[PDB]
Design a protein around this nucleic acid. Structure first.
Lengths: 132, 57, 185, 62
RNA sequence: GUUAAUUCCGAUAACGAACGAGACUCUGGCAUGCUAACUAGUUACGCGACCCCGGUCGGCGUAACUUCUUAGAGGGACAAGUGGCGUUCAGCCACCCGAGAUUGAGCAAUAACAGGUCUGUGAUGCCCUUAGAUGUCCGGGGCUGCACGCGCGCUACACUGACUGGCUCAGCGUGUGCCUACCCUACGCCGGCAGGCGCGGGUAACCCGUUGAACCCCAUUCGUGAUGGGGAUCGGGGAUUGCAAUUAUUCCCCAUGAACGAGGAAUUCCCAGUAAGUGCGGGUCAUAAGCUUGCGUUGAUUAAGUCCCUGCCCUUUGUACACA
């Protein structure tokens, strides 16, 4: 039974959140880094925190981690959100129009349009899942 | 753990007081708590984007 | 002898393990044979680490029982050595081969258990354990209150178990357990 | 009835009331297309040979 | 889902938290690196003794050192790395490297027990006695009594053993007292023995003590006989401690020589330096361990699972119980 507790885990998350650039991959390097940056009164707790820091860095190298706020991953998230794609799928030359939608558009102001394509209605009214 | 002698009987008094921690050691102990993990704040530094020098003498 | 290991005066080789079910659980060939079966320990720390212990050391460790004899490993090494001498001076073959044949011909292939009892087959390591325990119990029963010594009784039990003449107490208890398991199935 | 040999390929679980018998999938080494499920006493690791006296009786899977 | 754990992952009318667990302290191996050593040793010599250049000497002294000895700062292990299982998170198994990849003890939450202690207190409330005392002292007896049953232990029921010689290995420890009148003992004589007499050492890594402890190792005697197993009971004698041994205080010598042939229903403890065999220290001690607590030697079988029995902890259900 080798399971870390919350006093190890939350403190290690704060250490990685505040000092992500100083920490690395090697255990015997970031162990001494966590010793120098954090006041840990015992070697056993220091080794637990350093091991959980190494395991979270392995999780970072494998992919994204939920309970963390890294500035570089936040910048990458902001870049992927602010990425602008090519021309839209809303701007099409052929837009499939159902006949009742064509009727209500005729009853509205814009009845006859330029780049619409009216389609045939789905014959056969079978749309419900059978019971049981 | 103290006693008090009343007229009817004798009552016991248990007073347990947890002392806070200080770095000096006057009001409390010198060694900190094992559960408390002290993490300092990183200094607000600005990353340089232009190679400059600080030559003197 | 830096090439081959001489168990006392006995070679490591010329050991014909007939049963293919016991070739991993009898550790006597080329890796776990030594000069004497005496050792320090550590063989019973893990679950399947007991199978890597050599069978002569297992007989050595299982011989010391019943209070007054628990903790005389040098003394039961003396017993096993003189018993191997008596086995060679009666049979004329390798006493290690006689002991392996005794394990094969004395280990019961089935047993009864409770899930009214039902008969199930046993593990091969469990069969080696049961065979060693039955032959040690037969040797101690033959040596209890008798002029015939413990080495002579253990030699007679191993030779009768390798022969299969239904004279050994281990062979008799194996036949009894086989009859009970054939009954309650 | 003859006496067969079977190699353990998978252990399933602990059976019995006291938990003394393992539920063991054994492949017959003579005919590898036929395999059965039995109860075996003692410690069983996957990949060893057992000596079956008969293949008629077979316990129910729980 | 996972863990020894309300330990975490993750959903979530919850969020922020607190005690416990975890964390903590000590004990144990890993260090040929540091600090140190005439209250400990090692290596080289100067000798001396013995055997035929070499070997031994805890026989002596010294030029370095801590490897053996000791205790301080430390460091070292954290699921660290690989391969699988698993929401790829929490975690689990195996393995290379490695002294350890689960050592043990202490502390140990809220609330309760009509649990034990008034016979620990000049801690104490209420009741009783208080001079022919339930205060205190002296002398003796008893707390040991014996048709019986129960509980914890010790010795054996034997040849894997008994007896006799030879050999060979420890650490917890303790040691001269306010009153206190009582310490541990080296060595030489008297005696078979318990012991007695003299000078010594030690307030303790100096002296007991290199702590020459048992099982175990080797060689004769025994021969399946309640026998050289076992030592219950009992007689005669000799010494130690104490004012006083009778109801044998304890120790030693000779002799008498019982049950016990592996123990029924039932029941206790345990899985690694563990059980068990075995002996040595402290407390009780003037005389004393068949007890207890520590320590050392030899040292396994079987298992890495389960609710079957006995109980415990979460969820749901039922209650006509709530001294449940």
């Amino acid at each position: 039974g080798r399971v870390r507790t919350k006093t190890v885990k939350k403190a290690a998350r704060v250490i990685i959140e505040k000092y992500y650039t100083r920490l690395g991959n090697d255990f015997h390097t970031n162990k001494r880094v966590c010793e120098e940056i954090a006041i840990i009164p015992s070697k056993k707790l220091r080794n637990k925190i350093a091991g959980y820091v190494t395991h979270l860095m392995k999780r970072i190298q494998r992919g994204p981690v939920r309970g963390i706020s890294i500035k570089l991953q936040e910048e990458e998230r902001e870049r992927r959100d602010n990425y602008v794609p090519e021309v839209s799928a809303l701007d099409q030359e052929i837009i499939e129009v159902d006949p009742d939608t064509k009727e209500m558009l005729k009853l509205l102001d814009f009845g006859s349009l330029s780049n619409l394509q009216v389609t045939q209605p789905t014959v056969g009214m079978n749309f419900k899942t059978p019971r049981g | 753990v103290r006693h008090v002698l009343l007229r009817q009987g004798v009552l016991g008094i248990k007073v347990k007081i947890m002392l806070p921690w200080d770095p000096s050691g006057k009001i409390g102990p010198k060694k900190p708590l094992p559960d408390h993990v002290s993490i300092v704040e990183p200094k607000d530094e600005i990353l340089p984007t232009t190679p400059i020098s600080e030559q003197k003498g | 002898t830096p090439d081959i290991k001489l168990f006392g005066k006995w070679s490591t080789d010329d050991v014909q393990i007939n049963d293919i079910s016991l070739q991993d659980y009898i550790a006597v060939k080329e890796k776990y044979a030594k000069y004497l079966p005496h050792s320090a320990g550590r063989y019973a720390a893990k679950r399947f680490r007991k199978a890597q212990c050599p069978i002569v050391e297992r007989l050595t460790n299982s011989m010391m029982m019943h209070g007054r004899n628990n903790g005389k490993k040098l003394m039961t090494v003396r017993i096993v050595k003189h018993a191997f001498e008596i086995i060679h001076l009666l049979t004329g073959e390798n006493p290690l081969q006689v002991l392996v044949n005794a394990i094969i011909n004395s280990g019961p292939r089935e047993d009864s258990t409770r899930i009214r009892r039902q008969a199930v087959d046993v593990s091969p390591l469990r069969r080696v354990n049961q065979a060693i325990w039955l032959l040690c119990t037969g040797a101690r029963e033959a040596a209890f209150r008798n002029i015939k010594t413990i080495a002579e009784c253990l030699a007679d039990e191993l030779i009768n178990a390798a022969k299969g003449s239904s004279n050994s107490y281990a062979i008799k208890k194996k036949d009894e357990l086989e009859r009970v398991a054939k009954s309650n199935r | 009835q003859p006496i067969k040999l079977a190699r353990v390929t998978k252990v399933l679980g602990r059976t019995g009331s006291q938990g003394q018998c393992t539920q063991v999938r054994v492949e017959f080494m003579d005919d590898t297309s036929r395999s059965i499920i039995r109860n075996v006493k003692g410690p069983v690791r996957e990949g060893d040979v057992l000596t079956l006296l008969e293949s008629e009786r077979e316990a129910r899977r729980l």
